[PDB]
């Protein structure tokens, strides 16, 4: 089906305590597979998924060299940003970047990405054409001119249209047994009295993959999203996710409420109700 590969990076300056902290992780779909943390004597990128451990030493060597180079460039970039914004070296700042690609079922590129954020806000991002830039403010406009003059877009586009897609296809085949398998959610409805006149109906979805899913509560077939409490999809810690939706109903109306679950791992949408 449709898949993606994403590399996330975060550098945080640490005034008076040492060099900035640099942490980067790579994901294929919702599966984390590589990590690098600068907080070590001799840090190296490490595997986080079984299907990537088979890569040879040259792979880890190159990845580690790239990670170390990115940490250094980030340190220089943080210094540049302090000048662009006339900020003091005594304050902590954060620089984030994410880049990756999406491939359709045919294995061909669907969309590429490359975007930066400074202090949690959009800084500069590569447009969908993978050839032009969108700057968020005057400071990012300085970077844009520099990147336009240095033909940065064409270099990123070459990587995003080539290696990004080619290596994503490689990982998808090696991890086929898990990355190309959708784990349907295990579902059930729980009942929790709030008083003698009201009760909470909670619809659960557990151990599912990927993370995308839709949970809705209906009363007599009418969507109750306005009165539905929906928690953010959360990780179980075993690579699968969990989510639940709840509604408060007047005691005695419970059997009129049905929970609707939609997940790519389910052949058809599921309808569930409280079964005491």
């Amino acid at each position: 089906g449709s898949h993606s590969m994403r590399y996330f990076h975060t550098s945080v300056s640490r005034p008076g305590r040492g060099e900035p902290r640099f942490i980067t992780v790579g994901y294929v779909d919702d599966t984390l597979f590589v990590r690098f943390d600068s907080d070590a004597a001799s840090p190296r990128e490490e595997p986080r998924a079984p299907w990537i451990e088979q890569e040879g030493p040259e792979y880890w060597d190159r990845e580690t060299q790239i990670c170390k180079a990115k940490a250094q460039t980030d340190r220089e970039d943080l210094r540049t940003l302090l000048r662009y914004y006339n900020q003091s070296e005594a304050g902590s700042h954060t620089l984030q970047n994410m880049y990756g690609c999406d491939v359709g079922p045919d294995g061909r590129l669907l969309r590429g990405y490359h975007q930066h954020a400074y202090d949690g806000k959009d800084y500069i991002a590569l447009n969908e054409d993978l050839s032009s830039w969108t700057a968020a403010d005057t400071a990012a406009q300085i970077t844009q001119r520099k990147w336009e003059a240095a033909r940065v877009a064409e270099q990123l586009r070459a990587y995003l249209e080539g290696e990004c897609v080619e290596w994503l296809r490689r990982y998808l085949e090696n991890g086929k047994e898990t990355l190309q398998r959708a784990d349907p959610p295990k579902t059930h409805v729980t009942h929790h009295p709030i008083s003698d006149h009201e009760a909470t109906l909670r619809c659960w979805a557990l151990g599912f993959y990927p993370a995308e899913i839709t949970l809705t509560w209906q009363r007599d077939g009418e969507d109750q999203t306005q009165d539905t409490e929906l928690v953010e999809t959360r990780p179980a810690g075993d690579r699968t996710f969990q989510k639940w939706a709840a509604v408060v109903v007047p005691s005695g109306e419970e059997q009129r409420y049905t929970c609707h679950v939609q997940h790519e791992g389910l052949p058809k949408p599921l309808t569930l109700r409280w079964e005491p």
């Binding site: 990845e63 790239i66 180079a69 460039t73 220089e76 290696e163």
Partner: peptide, 9 residues
């Protein structure tokens, strides 16, 4: 695998 970034903002 990752892309190379040697210099850069």
């Amino acid at each position: 695998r990752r892309k190379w970034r040697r210099w850069x903002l």
